[PDB]
PDB file of all heavy atoms in Angstrom:
ATOM      1  N   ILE N   1     -15.130  14.104   8.792  1.00 39.07           N
ATOM      2  CA  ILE N   1     -14.380  12.899   9.039  1.00 39.07           C
ATOM      3  C   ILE N   1     -15.218  11.827   9.693  1.00 39.07           C
ATOM      4  O   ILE N   1     -15.208  10.641   9.302  1.00 39.07           O
ATOM      5  CB  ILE N   1     -13.139  13.237   9.866  1.00 39.07           C
ATOM      6  CG1 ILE N   1     -12.202  14.070   9.004  1.00 39.07           C
ATOM      7  CG2 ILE N   1     -12.443  11.976  10.358  1.00 39.07           C
ATOM      8  CD1 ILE N   1     -11.124  14.811   9.744  1.00 39.07           C
ATOM      9  N   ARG N   2     -15.932  12.222  10.748  1.00 38.55           N
ATOM     10  CA  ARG N   2     -16.785  11.311  11.458  1.00 38.55           C
ATOM     11  C   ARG N   2     -17.839  10.720  10.557  1.00 38.55           C
ATOM     12  O   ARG N   2     -18.086   9.526  10.628  1.00 38.55           O
ATOM     13  CB  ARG N   2     -17.426  12.095  12.621  1.00 38.55           C
ATOM     14  CG  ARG N   2     -18.610  11.508  13.371  1.00 38.55           C
ATOM     15  CD  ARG N   2     -18.924  12.452  14.547  1.00 38.55           C
ATOM     16  NE  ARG N   2     -17.661  12.915  15.166  1.00 38.55           N
ATOM     17  CZ  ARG N   2     -17.240  14.186  15.306  1.00 38.55           C
ATOM     18  NH1 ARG N   2     -17.985  15.240  14.936  1.00 38.55           N
ATOM     19  NH2 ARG N   2     -16.053  14.398  15.875  1.00 38.55           N
ATOM     20  N   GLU N   3     -18.492  11.558   9.740  1.00 41.21           N
ATOM     21  CA  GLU N   3     -19.515  11.067   8.794  1.00 41.21           C
ATOM     22  C   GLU N   3     -18.901  10.074   7.807  1.00 41.21           C
ATOM     23  O   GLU N   3     -19.532   9.061   7.435  1.00 41.21           O
ATOM     24  CB  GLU N   3     -20.164  12.201   7.988  1.00 41.21           C
ATOM     25  CG  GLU N   3     -21.326  11.755   7.081  1.00 41.21           C
ATOM     26  CD  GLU N   3     -20.970  11.185   5.671  1.00 41.21           C
ATOM     27  OE1 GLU N   3     -20.054  11.702   4.971  1.00 41.21           O
ATOM     28  OE2 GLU N   3     -21.675  10.236   5.204  1.00 41.21           O
ATOM     29  N   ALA N   4     -17.684  10.352   7.371  1.00 42.68           N
ATOM     30  CA  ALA N   4     -17.109   9.465   6.309  1.00 42.68           C
ATOM     31  C   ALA N   4     -16.818   8.099   6.894  1.00 42.68           C
ATOM     32  O   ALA N   4     -17.143   7.104   6.295  1.00 42.68           O
ATOM     33  CB  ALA N   4     -15.881  10.055   5.682  1.00 42.68           C
ATOM     34  N   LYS N   5     -16.283   8.066   8.113  1.00 45.70           N
ATOM     35  CA  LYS N   5     -15.908   6.807   8.758  1.00 45.70           C
ATOM     36  C   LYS N   5     -17.134   5.961   9.039  1.00 45.70           C
ATOM     37  O   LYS N   5     -17.124   4.748   8.920  1.00 45.70           O
ATOM     38  CB  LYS N   5     -15.153   7.103  10.042  1.00 45.70           C
ATOM     39  CG  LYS N   5     -13.744   7.584   9.840  1.00 45.70           C
ATOM     40  CD  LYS N   5     -13.111   7.844  11.188  1.00 45.70           C
ATOM     41  CE  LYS N   5     -11.688   8.295  11.017  1.00 45.70           C
ATOM     42  NZ  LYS N   5     -11.065   8.521  12.342  1.00 45.70           N
ATOM     43  N   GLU N   6     -18.200   6.646   9.406  1.00 45.09           N
ATOM     44  CA  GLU N   6     -19.455   6.033   9.676  1.00 45.09           C
ATOM     45  C   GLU N   6     -20.023   5.422   8.429  1.00 45.09           C
ATOM     46  O   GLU N   6     -20.513   4.311   8.466  1.00 45.09           O
ATOM     47  CB  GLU N   6     -20.396   7.104  10.210  1.00 45.09           C
ATOM     48  CG  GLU N   6     -21.688   6.588  10.791  1.00 45.09           C
ATOM     49  CD  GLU N   6     -22.313   7.607  11.746  1.00 45.09           C
ATOM     50  OE1 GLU N   6     -21.538   8.355  12.419  1.00 45.09           O
ATOM     51  OE2 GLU N   6     -23.575   7.642  11.813  1.00 45.09           O
ATOM     52  N   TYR N   7     -19.984   6.166   7.315  1.00 45.83           N
ATOM     53  CA  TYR N   7     -20.461   5.656   6.032  1.00 45.83           C
ATOM     54  C   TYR N   7     -19.667   4.396   5.654  1.00 45.83           C
ATOM     55  O   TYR N   7     -20.244   3.375   5.233  1.00 45.83           O
ATOM     56  CB  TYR N   7     -20.313   6.763   4.947  1.00 45.83           C
ATOM     57  CG  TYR N   7     -20.719   6.290   3.582  1.00 45.83           C
ATOM     58  CD1 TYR N   7     -21.995   6.524   3.080  1.00 45.83           C
ATOM     59  CD2 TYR N   7     -19.796   5.597   2.772  1.00 45.83           C
ATOM     60  CE1 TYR N   7     -22.368   6.036   1.834  1.00 45.83           C
ATOM     61  CE2 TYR N   7     -20.160   5.130   1.535  1.00 45.83           C
ATOM     62  CZ  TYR N   7     -21.429   5.358   1.055  1.00 45.83           C
ATOM     63  OH  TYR N   7     -21.781   4.889  -0.205  1.00 45.83           O
ATOM     64  N   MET N   8     -18.355   4.465   5.825  1.00 46.01           N
ATOM     65  CA  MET N   8     -17.433   3.401   5.382  1.00 46.01           C
ATOM     66  C   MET N   8     -17.589   2.145   6.286  1.00 46.01           C
ATOM     67  O   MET N   8     -17.332   1.041   5.866  1.00 46.01           O
ATOM     68  CB  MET N   8     -15.986   3.923   5.369  1.00 46.01           C
ATOM     69  CG  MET N   8     -15.772   5.096   4.377  1.00 46.01           C
ATOM     70  SD  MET N   8     -14.253   6.026   4.518  1.00 46.01           S
ATOM     71  CE  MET N   8     -13.014   4.779   4.182  1.00 46.01           C
ATOM     72  N   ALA N   9     -18.018   2.370   7.532  1.00 44.63           N
ATOM     73  CA  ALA N   9     -18.248   1.308   8.497  1.00 44.63           C
ATOM     74  C   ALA N   9     -19.444   0.436   8.166  1.00 44.63           C
ATOM     75  O   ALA N   9     -19.566  -0.680   8.707  1.00 44.63           O
ATOM     76  CB  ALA N   9     -18.376   1.903   9.876  1.00 44.63           C
ATOM     77  N   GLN N  10     -20.275   0.856   7.222  1.00 43.72           N
ATOM     78  CA  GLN N  10     -21.345  -0.009   6.762  1.00 43.72           C
ATOM     79  C   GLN N  10     -20.873  -1.206   5.967  1.00 43.72           C
ATOM     80  O   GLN N  10     -21.631  -2.163   5.807  1.00 43.72           O
ATOM     81  CB  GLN N  10     -22.360   0.767   5.967  1.00 43.72           C
ATOM     82  CG  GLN N  10     -22.072   0.988   4.503  1.00 43.72           C
ATOM     83  CD  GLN N  10     -23.133   1.855   3.887  1.00 43.72           C
ATOM     84  OE1 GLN N  10     -24.187   1.351   3.533  1.00 43.72           O
ATOM     85  NE2 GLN N  10     -22.868   3.156   3.752  1.00 43.72           N
ATOM     86  N   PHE N  11     -19.633  -1.157   5.449  1.00 43.66           N
ATOM     87  CA  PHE N  11     -19.096  -2.247   4.658  1.00 43.66           C
ATOM     88  C   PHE N  11     -18.264  -3.200   5.505  1.00 43.66           C
ATOM     89  O   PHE N  11     -17.691  -2.788   6.495  1.00 43.66           O
ATOM     90  CB  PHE N  11     -18.227  -1.631   3.546  1.00 43.66           C
ATOM     91  CG  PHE N  11     -18.987  -0.666   2.695  1.00 43.66           C
ATOM     92  CD1 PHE N  11     -18.844   0.695   2.869  1.00 43.66           C
ATOM     93  CD2 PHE N  11     -19.910  -1.125   1.768  1.00 43.66           C
ATOM     94  CE1 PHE N  11     -19.562   1.589   2.094  1.00 43.66           C
ATOM     95  CE2 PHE N  11     -20.623  -0.252   0.980  1.00 43.66           C
ATOM     96  CZ  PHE N  11     -20.486   1.127   1.175  1.00 43.66           C
ATOM     97  N   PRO N  12     -18.108  -4.461   5.063  1.00 43.11           N
ATOM     98  CA  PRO N  12     -17.353  -5.411   5.881  1.00 43.11           C
ATOM     99  C   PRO N  12     -15.874  -5.116   5.954  1.00 43.11           C
ATOM    100  O   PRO N  12     -15.342  -4.377   5.093  1.00 43.11           O
ATOM    101  CB  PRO N  12     -17.600  -6.746   5.207  1.00 43.11           C
ATOM    102  CG  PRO N  12     -18.003  -6.433   3.840  1.00 43.11           C
ATOM    103  CD  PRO N  12     -18.542  -5.048   3.798  1.00 43.11           C
ATOM    104  N   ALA N  13     -15.224  -5.650   6.988  1.00 43.11           N
ATOM    105  CA  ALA N  13     -13.797  -5.454   7.175  1.00 43.11           C
ATOM    106  C   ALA N  13     -13.073  -5.901   5.882  1.00 43.11           C
ATOM    107  O   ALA N  13     -13.456  -6.836   5.243  1.00 43.11           O
ATOM    108  CB  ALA N  13     -13.301  -6.228   8.389  1.00 43.11           C
ATOM    109  N   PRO N  14     -12.016  -5.188   5.501  1.00 42.58           N
ATOM    110  CA  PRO N  14     -11.189  -5.684   4.407  1.00 42.58           C
ATOM    111  C   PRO N  14     -10.584  -7.045   4.723  1.00 42.58           C
ATOM    112  O   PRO N  14     -10.324  -7.327   5.864  1.00 42.58           O
ATOM    113  CB  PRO N  14     -10.068  -4.633   4.277  1.00 42.58           C
ATOM    114  CG  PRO N  14     -10.149  -3.773   5.474  1.00 42.58           C
ATOM    115  CD  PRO N  14     -11.449  -4.019   6.199  1.00 42.58           C
ATOM    116  N   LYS N  15     -10.317  -7.787   3.676  1.00 43.67           N
ATOM    117  CA  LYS N  15      -9.661  -9.109   3.747  1.00 43.67           C
ATOM    118  C   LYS N  15      -8.141  -8.968   3.937  1.00 43.67           C
ATOM    119  O   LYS N  15      -7.494  -9.871   4.488  1.00 43.67           O
ATOM    120  CB  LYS N  15      -9.980  -9.925   2.502  1.00 43.67           C
ATOM    121  CG  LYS N  15     -11.462 -10.313   2.407  1.00 43.67           C
ATOM    122  CD  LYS N  15     -11.851 -11.229   3.564  1.00 43.67           C
ATOM    123  CE  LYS N  15     -13.179 -11.931   3.325  1.00 43.67           C
ATOM    124  NZ  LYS N  15     -13.454 -12.851   4.474  1.00 43.67           N
ATOM    125  N   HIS N  16      -7.550  -7.813   3.531  1.00 41.24           N
ATOM    126  CA  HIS N  16      -6.115  -7.626   3.680  1.00 41.24           C
ATOM    127  C   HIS N  16      -5.741  -6.225   4.066  1.00 41.24           C
ATOM    128  O   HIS N  16      -6.468  -5.300   3.756  1.00 41.24           O
ATOM    129  CB  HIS N  16      -5.391  -7.983   2.370  1.00 41.24           C
ATOM    130  CG  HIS N  16      -5.540  -9.422   1.994  1.00 41.24           C
ATOM    131  ND1 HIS N  16      -6.538  -9.863   1.152  1.00 41.24           N
ATOM    132  CD2 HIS N  16      -4.877 -10.530   2.412  1.00 41.24           C
ATOM    133  CE1 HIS N  16      -6.473 -11.183   1.056  1.00 41.24           C
ATOM    134  NE2 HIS N  16      -5.497 -11.611   1.834  1.00 41.24           N
ATOM    135  N   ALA N  17      -4.579  -6.106   4.707  1.00 43.54           N
ATOM    136  CA  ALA N  17      -3.896  -4.841   4.970  1.00 43.54           C
ATOM    137  C   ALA N  17      -3.097  -4.296   3.792  1.00 43.54           C
ATOM    138  O   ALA N  17      -1.921  -4.061   3.897  1.00 43.54           O
ATOM    139  CB  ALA N  17      -3.005  -4.956   6.167  1.00 43.54           C
ATOM    140  N   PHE N  18      -3.763  -4.096   2.676  1.00 43.94           N
ATOM    141  CA  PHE N  18      -3.106  -3.810   1.430  1.00 43.94           C
ATOM    142  C   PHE N  18      -2.632  -2.339   1.309  1.00 43.94           C
ATOM    143  O   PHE N  18      -1.992  -1.975   0.328  1.00 43.94           O
ATOM    144  CB  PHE N  18      -3.994  -4.191   0.235  1.00 43.94           C
ATOM    145  CG  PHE N  18      -5.237  -3.374   0.104  1.00 43.94           C
ATOM    146  CD1 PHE N  18      -5.201  -2.138  -0.546  1.00 43.94           C
ATOM    147  CD2 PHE N  18      -6.451  -3.844   0.573  1.00 43.94           C
ATOM    148  CE1 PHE N  18      -6.338  -1.366  -0.644  1.00 43.94           C
ATOM    149  CE2 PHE N  18      -7.618  -3.081   0.464  1.00 43.94           C
ATOM    150  CZ  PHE N  18      -7.555  -1.846  -0.175  1.00 43.94           C
ATOM    151  N   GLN N  19      -2.864  -1.543   2.342  1.00 45.38           N
ATOM    152  CA  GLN N  19      -2.141  -0.261   2.508  1.00 45.38           C
ATOM    153  C   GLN N  19      -0.652  -0.467   2.559  1.00 45.38           C
ATOM    154  O   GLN N  19       0.100   0.480   2.376  1.00 45.38           O
ATOM    155  CB  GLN N  19      -2.628   0.504   3.725  1.00 45.38           C
ATOM    156  CG  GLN N  19      -2.291  -0.149   5.065  1.00 45.38           C
ATOM    157  CD  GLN N  19      -3.437  -1.014   5.594  1.00 45.38           C
ATOM    158  OE1 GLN N  19      -4.158  -1.690   4.850  1.00 45.38           O
ATOM    159  NE2 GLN N  19      -3.597  -0.984   6.913  1.00 45.38           N
ATOM    160  N   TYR N  20      -0.170  -1.738   2.756  1.00 46.67           N
ATOM    161  CA  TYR N  20       1.234  -2.015   2.759  1.00 46.67           C
ATOM    162  C   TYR N  20       1.720  -2.693   1.477  1.00 46.67           C
ATOM    163  O   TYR N  20       2.811  -3.196   1.458  1.00 46.67           O
ATOM    164  CB  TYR N  20       1.605  -2.851   4.022  1.00 46.67           C
ATOM    165  CG  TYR N  20       1.265  -2.094   5.300  1.00 46.67           C
ATOM    166  CD1 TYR N  20       0.451  -2.647   6.287  1.00 46.67           C
ATOM    167  CD2 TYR N  20       1.806  -0.837   5.541  1.00 46.67           C
ATOM    168  CE1 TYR N  20       0.143  -1.938   7.420  1.00 46.67           C
ATOM    169  CE2 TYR N  20       1.487  -0.121   6.659  1.00 46.67           C
ATOM    170  CZ  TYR N  20       0.663  -0.680   7.603  1.00 46.67           C
ATOM    171  OH  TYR N  20       0.370   0.068   8.746  1.00 46.67           O
ATOM    172  N   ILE N  21       0.884  -2.709   0.423  1.00 45.15           N
ATOM    173  CA  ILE N  21       1.214  -3.431  -0.806  1.00 45.15           C
ATOM    174  C   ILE N  21       2.223  -2.753  -1.736  1.00 45.15           C
ATOM    175  O   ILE N  21       2.250  -1.525  -1.885  1.00 45.15           O
ATOM    176  CB  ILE N  21      -0.089  -3.826  -1.532  1.00 45.15           C
ATOM    177  CG1 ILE N  21       0.128  -5.003  -2.490  1.00 45.15           C
ATOM    178  CG2 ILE N  21      -0.681  -2.645  -2.278  1.00 45.15           C
ATOM    179  CD1 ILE N  21      -1.180  -5.692  -2.831  1.00 45.15           C
ATOM    180  N   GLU N  22       3.060  -3.572  -2.356  1.00 45.42           N
ATOM    181  CA  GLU N  22       4.026  -3.114  -3.349  1.00 45.42           C
ATOM    182  C   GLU N  22       3.897  -4.026  -4.560  1.00 45.42           C
ATOM    183  O   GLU N  22       3.534  -5.198  -4.400  1.00 45.42           O
ATOM    184  CB  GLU N  22       5.469  -3.213  -2.840  1.00 45.42           C
ATOM    185  CG  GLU N  22       6.133  -1.849  -2.540  1.00 45.42           C
ATOM    186  CD  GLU N  22       6.362  -0.955  -3.741  1.00 45.42           C
ATOM    187  OE1 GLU N  22       6.165  -1.424  -4.909  1.00 45.42           O
ATOM    188  OE2 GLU N  22       6.785   0.206  -3.521  1.00 45.42           O
ATOM    189  N   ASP N  23       4.210  -3.484  -5.726  1.00 43.70           N
ATOM    190  CA  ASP N  23       4.358  -4.327  -6.949  1.00 43.70           C
ATOM    191  C   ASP N  23       5.803  -4.335  -7.432  1.00 43.70           C
ATOM    192  O   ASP N  23       6.052  -4.612  -8.601  1.00 43.70           O
ATOM    193  CB  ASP N  23       3.424  -3.895  -8.071  1.00 43.70           C
ATOM    194  CG  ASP N  23       3.670  -2.477  -8.540  1.00 43.70           C
ATOM    195  OD1 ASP N  23       4.484  -1.763  -7.858  1.00 43.70           O
ATOM    196  OD2 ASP N  23       3.059  -2.108  -9.585  1.00 43.70           O
ATOM    197  N   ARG N  24       6.732  -4.034  -6.518  1.00 44.53           N
ATOM    198  CA  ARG N  24       8.138  -3.983  -6.781  1.00 44.53           C
ATOM    199  C   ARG N  24       8.887  -4.643  -5.659  1.00 44.53           C
ATOM    200  O   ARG N  24       8.447  -4.613  -4.511  1.00 44.53           O
ATOM    201  CB  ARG N  24       8.647  -2.527  -6.938  1.00 44.53           C
ATOM    202  CG  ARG N  24       7.901  -1.811  -8.064  1.00 44.53           C
ATOM    203  CD  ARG N  24       8.113  -0.308  -8.127  1.00 44.53           C
ATOM    204  NE  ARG N  24       7.565   0.302  -6.896  1.00 44.53           N
ATOM    205  CZ  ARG N  24       7.637   1.614  -6.665  1.00 44.53           C
ATOM    206  NH1 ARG N  24       8.124   2.447  -7.578  1.00 44.53           N
ATOM    207  NH2 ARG N  24       7.241   2.077  -5.487  1.00 44.53           N
ATOM    208  N   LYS N  25      10.055  -5.212  -5.997  1.00 47.00           N
ATOM    209  CA  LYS N  25      10.983  -5.689  -4.980  1.00 47.00           C
ATOM    210  C   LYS N  25      12.387  -5.284  -5.310  1.00 47.00           C
ATOM    211  O   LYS N  25      12.743  -5.019  -6.452  1.00 47.00           O
ATOM    212  CB  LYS N  25      10.873  -7.199  -4.767  1.00 47.00           C
ATOM    213  CG  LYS N  25      11.068  -8.018  -5.998  1.00 47.00           C
ATOM    214  CD  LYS N  25      10.664  -9.490  -5.761  1.00 47.00           C
ATOM    215  CE  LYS N  25      10.717 -10.216  -7.094  1.00 47.00           C
ATOM    216  NZ  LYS N  25      10.255 -11.642  -7.084  1.00 47.00           N
ATOM    217  N   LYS N  26      13.192  -5.253  -4.276  1.00 46.95           N
ATOM    218  CA  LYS N  26      14.538  -4.721  -4.351  1.00 46.95           C
ATOM    219  C   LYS N  26      15.409  -5.350  -5.476  1.00 46.95           C
ATOM    220  O   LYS N  26      16.184  -4.658  -6.168  1.00 46.95           O
ATOM    221  CB  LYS N  26      15.154  -4.975  -2.970  1.00 46.95           C
ATOM    222  CG  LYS N  26      16.485  -4.385  -2.751  1.00 46.95           C
ATOM    223  CD  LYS N  26      16.808  -4.371  -1.267  1.00 46.95           C
ATOM    224  CE  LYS N  26      17.965  -3.434  -1.047  1.00 46.95           C
ATOM    225  NZ  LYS N  26      18.631  -3.620   0.265  1.00 46.95           N
ATOM    226  N   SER N  27      15.263  -6.655  -5.622  1.00 45.70           N
ATOM    227  CA  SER N  27      16.061  -7.450  -6.552  1.00 45.70           C
ATOM    228  C   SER N  27      15.801  -7.070  -8.001  1.00 45.70           C
ATOM    229  O   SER N  27      16.547  -7.484  -8.888  1.00 45.70           O
ATOM    230  CB  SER N  27      15.726  -8.947  -6.360  1.00 45.70           C
ATOM    231  OG  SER N  27      14.349  -9.207  -6.602  1.00 45.70           O
ATOM    232  N   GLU N  28      14.724  -6.313  -8.257  1.00 46.24           N
ATOM    233  CA  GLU N  28      14.369  -5.879  -9.627  1.00 46.24           C
ATOM    234  C   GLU N  28      15.117  -4.667 -10.107  1.00 46.24           C
ATOM    235  O   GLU N  28      14.961  -4.278 -11.260  1.00 46.24           O
ATOM    236  CB  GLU N  28      12.856  -5.637  -9.770  1.00 46.24           C
ATOM    237  CG  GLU N  28      12.035  -6.885  -9.538  1.00 46.24           C
ATOM    238  CD  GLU N  28      10.535  -6.623  -9.415  1.00 46.24           C
ATOM    239  OE1 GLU N  28      10.153  -5.593  -8.878  1.00 46.24           O
ATOM    240  OE2 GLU N  28       9.723  -7.426  -9.914  1.00 46.24           O
ATOM    241  N   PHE N  29      15.925  -4.029  -9.256  1.00 41.53           N
ATOM    242  CA  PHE N  29      16.487  -2.739  -9.589  1.00 41.53           C
ATOM    243  C   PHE N  29      17.989  -2.711  -9.370  1.00 41.53           C
ATOM    244  O   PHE N  29      18.452  -3.311  -8.415  1.00 41.53           O
ATOM    245  CB  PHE N  29      15.885  -1.633  -8.695  1.00 41.53           C
ATOM    246  CG  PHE N  29      14.412  -1.523  -8.856  1.00 41.53           C
ATOM    247  CD1 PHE N  29      13.592  -2.116  -7.950  1.00 41.53           C
ATOM    248  CD2 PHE N  29      13.869  -0.956 -10.014  1.00 41.53           C
ATOM    249  CE1 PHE N  29      12.229  -2.106  -8.122  1.00 41.53           C
ATOM    250  CE2 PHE N  29      12.485  -0.953 -10.210  1.00 41.53           C
ATOM    251  CZ  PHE N  29      11.681  -1.509  -9.250  1.00 41.53           C
ATOM    252  N   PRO N  30      18.699  -1.976 -10.206  1.00 45.00           N
ATOM    253  CA  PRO N  30      20.100  -1.785  -9.870  1.00 45.00           C
ATOM    254  C   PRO N  30      20.265  -0.845  -8.664  1.00 45.00           C
ATOM    255  O   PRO N  30      19.377  -0.022  -8.369  1.00 45.00           O
ATOM    256  CB  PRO N  30      20.665  -1.139 -11.110  1.00 45.00           C
ATOM    257  CG  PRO N  30      19.537  -0.420 -11.759  1.00 45.00           C
ATOM    258  CD  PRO N  30      18.306  -1.228 -11.413  1.00 45.00           C
ATOM    259  N   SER N  31      21.392  -0.948  -7.975  1.00 38.64           N
ATOM    260  CA  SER N  31      21.597  -0.119  -6.763  1.00 38.64           C
ATOM    261  C   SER N  31      21.550   1.407  -7.019  1.00 38.64           C
ATOM    262  O   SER N  31      21.338   2.181  -6.104  1.00 38.64           O
ATOM    263  CB  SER N  31      22.935  -0.509  -6.139  1.00 38.64           C
ATOM    264  OG  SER N  31      23.959   0.004  -6.948  1.00 38.64           O
ATOM    265  N   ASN N  32      21.716   1.847  -8.256  1.00 40.85           N
ATOM    266  CA  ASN N  32      21.718   3.261  -8.600  1.00 40.85           C
ATOM    267  C   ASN N  32      20.315   3.785  -8.879  1.00 40.85           C
ATOM    268  O   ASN N  32      20.136   4.963  -9.155  1.00 40.85           O
ATOM    269  CB  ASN N  32      22.516   3.462  -9.896  1.00 40.85           C
ATOM    270  CG  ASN N  32      21.972   2.583 -11.037  1.00 40.85           C
ATOM    271  OD1 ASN N  32      22.337   1.436 -11.121  1.00 40.85           O
ATOM    272  ND2 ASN N  32      21.049   3.101 -11.850  1.00 40.85           N
ATOM    273  N   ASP N  33      19.315   2.902  -8.884  1.00 39.27           N
ATOM    274  CA  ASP N  33      17.962   3.313  -9.206  1.00 39.27           C
ATOM    275  C   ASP N  33      17.278   3.722  -7.881  1.00 39.27           C
ATOM    276  O   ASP N  33      17.398   3.014  -6.907  1.00 39.27           O
ATOM    277  CB  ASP N  33      17.228   2.130  -9.861  1.00 39.27           C
ATOM    278  CG  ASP N  33      15.809   2.474 -10.320  1.00 39.27           C
ATOM    279  OD1 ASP N  33      14.905   2.778  -9.524  1.00 39.27           O
ATOM    280  OD2 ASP N  33      15.539   2.360 -11.530  1.00 39.27           O
ATOM    281  N   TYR N  34      16.540   4.811  -7.905  1.00 38.01           N
ATOM    282  CA  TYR N  34      15.853   5.302  -6.695  1.00 38.01           C
ATOM    283  C   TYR N  34      14.990   4.224  -5.990  1.00 38.01           C
ATOM    284  O   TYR N  34      14.899   4.159  -4.752  1.00 38.01           O
ATOM    285  CB  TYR N  34      15.049   6.587  -7.023  1.00 38.01           C
ATOM    286  CG  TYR N  34      13.700   6.403  -7.749  1.00 38.01           C
ATOM    287  CD1 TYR N  34      12.508   6.611  -7.047  1.00 38.01           C
ATOM    288  CD2 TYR N  34      13.609   6.027  -9.128  1.00 38.01           C
ATOM    289  CE1 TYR N  34      11.273   6.445  -7.659  1.00 38.01           C
ATOM    290  CE2 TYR N  34      12.365   5.858  -9.741  1.00 38.01           C
ATOM    291  CZ  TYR N  34      11.204   6.078  -8.999  1.00 38.01           C
ATOM    292  OH  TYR N  34       9.933   5.931  -9.548  1.00 38.01           O
ATOM    293  N   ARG N  35      14.409   3.317  -6.757  1.00 37.84           N
ATOM    294  CA  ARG N  35      13.554   2.314  -6.193  1.00 37.84           C
ATOM    295  C   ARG N  35      14.255   1.223  -5.391  1.00 37.84           C
ATOM    296  O   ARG N  35      13.655   0.606  -4.517  1.00 37.84           O
ATOM    297  CB  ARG N  35      12.698   1.704  -7.328  1.00 37.84           C
ATOM    298  CG  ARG N  35      11.701   2.749  -7.834  1.00 37.84           C
ATOM    299  CD  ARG N  35      11.033   2.372  -9.163  1.00 37.84           C
ATOM    300  NE  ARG N  35      12.051   2.396 -10.229  1.00 37.84           N
ATOM    301  CZ  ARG N  35      11.803   2.211 -11.525  1.00 37.84           C
ATOM    302  NH1 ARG N  35      10.584   1.962 -11.965  1.00 37.84           N
ATOM    303  NH2 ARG N  35      12.807   2.236 -12.376  1.00 37.84           N
ATOM    304  N   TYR N  36      15.537   0.982  -5.671  1.00 37.91           N
ATOM    305  CA  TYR N  36      16.287  -0.064  -4.984  1.00 37.91           C
ATOM    306  C   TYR N  36      16.199   0.114  -3.435  1.00 37.91           C
ATOM    307  O   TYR N  36      15.829  -0.808  -2.707  1.00 37.91           O
ATOM    308  CB  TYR N  36      17.721   0.010  -5.445  1.00 37.91           C
ATOM    309  CG  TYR N  36      18.659  -0.943  -4.781  1.00 37.91           C
ATOM    310  CD1 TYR N  36      18.688  -2.283  -5.129  1.00 37.91           C
ATOM    311  CD2 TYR N  36      19.539  -0.492  -3.805  1.00 37.91           C
ATOM    312  CE1 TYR N  36      19.575  -3.163  -4.527  1.00 37.91           C
ATOM    313  CE2 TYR N  36      20.401  -1.357  -3.173  1.00 37.91           C
ATOM    314  CZ  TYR N  36      20.429  -2.694  -3.543  1.00 37.91           C
ATOM    315  OH  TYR N  36      21.289  -3.562  -2.921  1.00 37.91           O
ATOM    316  N   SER N  37      16.508   1.328  -3.000  1.00 42.00           N
ATOM    317  CA  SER N  37      16.550   1.632  -1.569  1.00 42.00           C
ATOM    318  C   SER N  37      15.207   2.066  -1.008  1.00 42.00           C
ATOM    319  O   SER N  37      15.064   2.106   0.193  1.00 42.00           O
ATOM    320  CB  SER N  37      17.622   2.683  -1.278  1.00 42.00           C
ATOM    321  OG  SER N  37      17.192   3.956  -1.698  1.00 42.00           O
ATOM    322  N   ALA N  38      14.243   2.383  -1.855  1.00 41.18           N
ATOM    323  CA  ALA N  38      12.945   2.892  -1.433  1.00 41.18           C
ATOM    324  C   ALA N  38      11.874   1.853  -1.195  1.00 41.18           C
ATOM    325  O   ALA N  38      10.974   2.053  -0.371  1.00 41.18           O
ATOM    326  CB  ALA N  38      12.439   3.856  -2.481  1.00 41.18           C
ATOM    327  N   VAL N  39      11.888   0.759  -1.980  1.00 42.31           N
ATOM    328  CA  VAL N  39      10.741  -0.131  -1.947  1.00 42.31           C
ATOM    329  C   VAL N  39      10.571  -1.053  -0.711  1.00 42.31           C
ATOM    330  O   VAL N  39       9.579  -1.777  -0.612  1.00 42.31           O
ATOM    331  CB  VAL N  39      10.590  -0.958  -3.236  1.00 42.31           C
ATOM    332  CG1 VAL N  39      10.374  -0.051  -4.414  1.00 42.31           C
ATOM    333  CG2 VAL N  39      11.752  -1.895  -3.452  1.00 42.31           C
ATOM    334  N   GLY N  40      11.518  -1.054   0.195  1.00 38.34           N
ATOM    335  CA  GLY N  40      11.408  -1.932   1.367  1.00 38.34           C
ATOM    336  C   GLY N  40      11.712  -3.370   1.071  1.00 38.34           C
ATOM    337  O   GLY N  40      12.232  -3.698   0.001  1.00 38.34           O
ATOM    338  N   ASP N  41      11.438  -4.194   2.068  1.00 40.12           N
ATOM    339  CA  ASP N  41      11.706  -5.639   2.051  1.00 40.12           C
ATOM    340  C   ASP N  41      10.493  -6.530   1.968  1.00 40.12           C
ATOM    341  O   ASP N  41      10.570  -7.623   1.341  1.00 40.12           O
ATOM    342  CB  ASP N  41      12.524  -5.997   3.300  1.00 40.12           C
ATOM    343  CG  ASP N  41      13.812  -5.256   3.376  1.00 40.12           C
ATOM    344  OD1 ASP N  41      14.624  -5.268   2.398  1.00 40.12           O
ATOM    345  OD2 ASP N  41      14.077  -4.656   4.434  1.00 40.12           O
TER     346      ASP N  41
END
């Protein structure tokens, strides 16, 4: 783990917190679809 973080630290900081990215939004789904309640706001 330590070696990997060190290796990855050679590169510049990311431009975005895209660990929080979605390509879906609630309004795209009917209320009966699993994604309606899952995808967040």
